[PDB]
Amino acid sequence: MGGVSDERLDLVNERDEVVGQILRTDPALRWERVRVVNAFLRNSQGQLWIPRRSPSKSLFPNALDVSVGGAVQSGETYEEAFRREAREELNVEIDALSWRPLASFSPFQTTLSSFMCVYELRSDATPIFNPNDISGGEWLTPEHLLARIAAGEAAKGDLAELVRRCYREEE
Numbered sequence: 001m002g003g004v005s006d007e008r009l010d011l012v013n014e015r016d017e018v019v020g021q022i023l024r025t026d027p028a029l030r031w032e033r034v035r036v037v038n039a040f041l042r043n044s045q046g047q048l049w050i051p052r053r054s055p056s057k058s059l060f061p062n063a064l065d066v067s068v069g070g071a072v073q074s075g076e077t078y079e080e081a082f083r084r085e086a087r088e089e090l091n092v093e094i095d096a097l098s099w100r101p102l103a104s105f106s107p108f109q110t111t112l113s114s115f116m117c118v119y120e121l122r123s124d125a126t127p128i129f130n131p132n133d134i135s136g137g138e139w140l141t142p143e144h145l146l147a148r149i150a151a152g153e154a155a156k157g158d159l160a161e162l163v164r165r166c167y168r169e170e171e
Contacts, residue, residue, distance in 0.1 A: 010074050024071055035075050036116035036133070037082045038105060041067035043124045048145045051137030052153075062111065063155035066118060069133040078117060090125035097122045109159065 011020045022029050041049045051065045068089065072081035079094070086092040086099075099121040106115040113133065127136040140148070146164065149155035155163075165171055 007071055007073055009071075031114055034114045035072050035078075036069065036112075036114050037072055037078060037085060037119075038066040038069040038112075038116035038133075039082065039099070039119035039121050040102065041121055041123055041125065043122050046142055047124055047139055048142060049124065049137055049139045050145065051134060052140060052148060053137075061154045063159050064149060064153065065134050065137065066105075066116075067134070067137060068121070068127055069116065070130065082119060086121060086123075088128065090123060092121070092123055092125070094121065 007024050009022045009024065010018055011022065012018045049067045055062075068085060070081070070085045072078060073084070082099075083094045086094045099119050101117060102120040103118045104116075105112050105118050124139070127134065130136075146160075149160050149163070
């Protein structure tokens with residue numbers, strides 16, 4: 001009774017016995033330790049796209065926010081999820097340019113809304129209607145990026161050093 005839709009989460013036993021049908025819009029679930037797909041979009045060896053604007057509405061600081069962040073359909077294959085996202089943004093299909101899991105944001109050092117992964121995709125495409133996770137940051141440079149996190153964006157200390165040594169240095 002129905003069909004596809006704006007992303008849906010179907011819970012099935014193992015074969016094809018859907019135990020429960022949870023919707024992304026449905027608040028029935030408790031969003032906190034859910035699964036999410038996050039990634040940083042960079043290209044041209046210098047074009048780093050990431051949110052810079054400060055949240056005047058909300059009342060909670062943060063280190064940094066990824067570029068492309070969405071939800072995982074059903075929940076089982078992170079590749080399929082991220083793929084659909086990268087395909088809808090620029091039909092990249094995460095199999096034309098080059099992508100690699102930079103890390104995983106969730107534990108605490110990152111502090112996000114839920115358990116999301118971090119993948120580095122080589123490209124320069126704008127996001128879509130998503131003002132919940134990240135409406136879409138801006139395209140800054142390497143000097144401005146490091147200069148921002150160092151200035152005062154709650155992305156300093158071990159956090160900044162970790163990225164500075166990971167990006168610049170190879171250790």
